Design a protein around this ligand. Structure first.
Ligand SMILES: [Ca+2]
Length: 107
């Protein structure tokens, strides 16, 4: 890969958008407020956070957040973020195949 894979451009941009204060960490409020644009249910939005905030830091690192977006697209793909699905979305080759989710921002 040449680093800048099509999806990753937006994966980053979503991070850049989610990080409201721009300190480089996605705070939960920043995350949740961003994921409001995803069009997913509050349980899912909460869940994606929990699934991405694996360090339990209360902030998503760029990497955590890059995972988070994959999970979003999974729910976007009309799936349920089940243990296997979450693992599927993050911990398999297919995770790289996952596009950036529909985040209603100003587009
Ligand atoms: Ca922040």
């Amino acid at each position: 890969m040449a680093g800048q894979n099509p999806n990753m451009d937006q994966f980053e941009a979503y991070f850049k958008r989610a990080d409201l204060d721009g300190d480089g960490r996605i705070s939960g409020a920043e995350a949740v407020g961003f994921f409001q644009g995803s069009g997913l249910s509050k349980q899912v939005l909460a869940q994606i956070w929990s699934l991405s905030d694996r360090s339990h830091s209360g902030f998503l690192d760029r990497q955590n957040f890059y995972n988070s977006l994959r999970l979003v697209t999974v729910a976007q793909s009309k799936r349920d973020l089940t243990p296997e699905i979450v693992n599927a979305a993050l911990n398999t080759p297919a995770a790289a195949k996952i596009p950036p989710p529909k985040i209603n921002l100003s587009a």
